[PDB]
Amino acid sequence: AQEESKIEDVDKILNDILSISSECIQPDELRVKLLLKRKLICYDGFEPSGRMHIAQGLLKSIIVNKLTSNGCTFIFWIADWFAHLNNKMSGDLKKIKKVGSYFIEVWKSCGMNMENVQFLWASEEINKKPNEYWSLVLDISRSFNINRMKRCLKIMGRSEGEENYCSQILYPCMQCADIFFLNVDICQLGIDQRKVNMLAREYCDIKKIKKKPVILSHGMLPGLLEGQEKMSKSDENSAIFMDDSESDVNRKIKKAYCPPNVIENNPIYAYAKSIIFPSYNEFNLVRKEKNGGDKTYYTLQELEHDYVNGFIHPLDLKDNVAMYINKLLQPVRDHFQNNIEAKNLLNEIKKYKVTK
Amino acid sequence: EESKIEDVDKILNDILSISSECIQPDELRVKLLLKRKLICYDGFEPSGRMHIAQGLLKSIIVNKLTSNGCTFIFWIADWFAHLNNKMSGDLKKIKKVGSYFIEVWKSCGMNMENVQFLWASEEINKKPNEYWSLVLDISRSFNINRMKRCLKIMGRSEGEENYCSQILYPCMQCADIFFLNVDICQLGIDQRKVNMLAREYCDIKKIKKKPVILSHGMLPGLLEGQEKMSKSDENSAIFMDDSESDVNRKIKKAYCPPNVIENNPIYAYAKSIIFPSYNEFNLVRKEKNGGDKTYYTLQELEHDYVNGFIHPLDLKDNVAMYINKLLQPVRDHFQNNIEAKNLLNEIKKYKVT
Ligand SMILES: Nc1ncnc2c1ncn2[C@@H]1O[C@H](COP(=O)(O)OC(=O)[C@@H](N)Cc2ccc(O)cc2)[C@@H](O)[C@H]1O
């Protein structure tokens, strides 16, 4: 037989999946998992705690498309109970659920392939099998000491510095339980969530569980301003939101940090690299004749090169980044304009006060 | 009208007299005027054989409370025992112990309509959303340090490695109080911190219906300095299934300092178990040692012991005899009810963790 084309295919698949990742734990387990002649279950989880920003909408969608076009199933875990537990929207569950419904409406208009995508609500799923779920949570809690768990504080945007409520011990125990409860093959969350993903791998070793989840962390999309490592709602003025208008996006991009001929810590370059290039498979720099005219970058290396050496002005990088982000947002805008029910949902959502 | 206030008053006096400490007496009165059928509960980790505090001592309090129209829930804390690593965390063993607990309780004075045997696992799982929602809401109300103040309710301390289970457990025990609609928490004083936690949670949440804590005193262990009979304090306990000779053996070896009442385990048993059960204490002994004497008050018993009128050996012989008398229905039930007998035999095999 010449099924050496299968090994070649897996390696092609592995390299493609990894190209979208910031850190894989571990790459070898991932290859192993891919040879499982079966769909791999991936998931990411979201606190419904305010407006969605483009990391959770546009960037997520690039990654999910890559996965589902390579034999994976993808679960969006609408972590409503988690948001409540973390005091979001003052812990008001009715508001959290409305935000959760809003998130789904966005994701459904993000040009994601839905054949292999699932939206699951934490509260619904847990309450379908509360004995199993809670037994798991308890078993996890008896396996790690308080200090160990306290080092997962980051997964909920918390620190040792603030007053540490017992809920901050339950939450990580519950997030860890999710991984097994949902039978995840691949935890595909942002790098800020990694500590609880590592905790789950540790749990496997402790319980001598052979089926171990692979941690496929993506990098943080940076905020608009210098020094903002993480676009988010809790970093004032860092985020472009999924409901931002065309002029909104233009205005935030124009005001963004984009240092001349430097790529490190440059959020504008980061959007070109992590969002636009993977979406278009090319970056087409449109620029005046005054400035060298249009040029298509077929590779990230060529792009980095022309930027770092001043061939690409910052203004030109900005203008194009803005344009593409607007084009990418257009389907979402169209949905929230043409679907009056979605429009109303967005409307109610914006009225909320973002509690921490 | 008057007789009503007399009724409630006497009752209130009955309830209060048992207790080592009641928080708060006034609230208890309000509770009785509001409802004659109060819900009281105590909770037990099925973590090994049941010692006499949880049976003979328990019965005295329970019967005094139920005879007044109260319902008393026995909370078989199976998931709690498992969470707290008892019986090697084997749910099957824990359940078997739970079943044996019920057989002991029904045979030592608590086979009655007003007593309920409830399993934590079962009850939680009838309304899991409500139970767990409560546990979560409690967790977001208290910080870790505050919660670690409840460590004694599970026999743990700050000193040892503190697993996250030791945070969840108190959240769950606190949730139980509301989940079972408890009017009176009737637990040992060693459980008081989580009971205070619940009262603190009410204030935080502006809950006006607030539980009364009616804590009973700890029964000392057999040996010197052991202030609490328990499975954890080594060779400190008399078990409800102990045979006559086991009882004699253990009482004989027990700590019983002459003249001294404080920290005297043997006197404690006489005082807290025997005397309330018989409403007297009949001291059998040789003429030369002082002869038989019937005590009608604890004051006379205490006076005589303090002054050395009763030698430790005479107190021990009599306490052993009485304890054996009190265990007789339990002994018979386990020698006769073959199902209960098999349960015991099996239960005795298990290693305590
Ligand atoms: N700026 C930026 N760049 C790339 N990825 C980002 C990002 N901000 C947030 N993310 C990722 O979005 C997912 C959800 O974010 P979150 O609402 O802050 O999630 C955390 O609160 C989780 N603890 C929610 C959760 C609960 C339970 C469970 O089983 C899984 C997740 C994250 O992947 C984040 O990295």
Ligand SMILES: Nc1ncnc2c1ncn2[C@@H]1O[C@H](COP(=O)(O)OC(=O)[C@@H](N)Cc2ccc(O)cc2)[C@@H](O)[C@H]1O
């Ligand atoms: N030596 C002694 N004297 C008097 N009372 C005693 C005693 N040792 C134990 N007790 C009381 O018996 C009950 C059961 O004791 P436990 O199994 O050690 O109870 C604790 O583990 C509880 N956390 C179990 C529990 C879980 C959940 C819930 O809602 C209620 C109870 C106790 O009253 C103890 O004081």
